[PDB]
Design a protein around this ligand. Structure first.
Ligand code: HEC
Ligand code: HEC
Lengths: 126, 126
């Protein structure tokens, strides 16, 4: 869907911006600093679920650029494992939110965050 | 969810970037220049539906900036009418996509696009 590689870079950076917001805005909830409203979190995690599927299609062939490492493309199966595993952790977060289980939400949230960082460590330029 | 107004501006601009992509990538389909696969479009419109609900919460009080006109805040009910009407046109696009009806998709797409432009004309800085 991208006329030029720059359009794919802009897309995936904007998807990442929205994922950071929808994930990070839950930090105070998981820490107990903000109240836990199960319906509010359920809805927010449903938005995060949608968004967390979106970046990967914007690392298509010829879309090199931004702060994306070339090893994303040369190790295609390894980068795929990482994004699929990240979305597996999103599924776990969804299950916790849908159940209304806060303890499970805490745990799942931590696992999601670790998966974000693991990918950036390997595949995002400093 | 925004620590500073700049964070709200960044969010709503990124949401708009993703909506432009998910809406605009259908132009060749509606024009017949690309093939119509009902399931593909159904899925894409479900992403657009999610995204098209997101900007409005990021024009919260104190989030003035970017290319957003102050009349967004001083005429709160009028700006609300416009975003609600835009999401009504999104619902119509969803119904067309879910039905697998291309002619209906064409028409709905045009109506959505007109609603984007009507809001920008009144509420986005040149
Ligand atoms: C690989 C499988 C990743 C996972 C999982 C996550 N991110 Fe990511 N992120 C990745 C790359 C390769 C890039 C660089 C994109 C580019 O072309 O520049 C990014 C970038 C971000 C950014 C910065 C966006 C920008 O302003 O330019 C943010 C804020 C970000 N990523 C956040 C983020 C979060 C919150 C994640 C888990 C919920 C997450 N990322 C996962 C690769 C990958
Ligand atoms: C008001 C109810 C709007 C509707 C409906 C749509 N848009 Fe919008 N858009 C609006 C404003 C007030 C702004 C400025 C935001 C800011 O603070 O700068 C925008 C911005 C955009 C942009 C530019 C984003 C950027 O790169 O900075 C784009 C690409 C955009 N809008 C696209 C877009 C599309 C495709 C829409 C219909 C599907 C749409 N907008 C509707 C206000 C409103």
């Amino acid at each position: 869907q991208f006329a030029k590689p720059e359009d794919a870079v802009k897309y995936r950076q904007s998807a990442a911006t929205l994922m950071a917001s929808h994930f990070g805005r839950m930090t105070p909830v998981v820490k107990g600093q903000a109240p836990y409203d199960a319906a509010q979190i359920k809805a927010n995690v449903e938005v995060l679920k949608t968004l967390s599927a979106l970046p990967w299609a914007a690392f298509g062939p010829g879309t090199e650029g931004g702060d994306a490492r070339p090893e994303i493309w040369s190790d295609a199966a390894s980068f795929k494992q990482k994004q699929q595993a990240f979305q597996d952790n999103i599924v776990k977060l969804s299950a916790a939110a849908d159940a209304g289980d806060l303890d499970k939400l805490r745990a799942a949230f931590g696992d999601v965050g670790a998966s974000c960082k693991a990918c950036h460590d390997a595949y995002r330029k400093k």
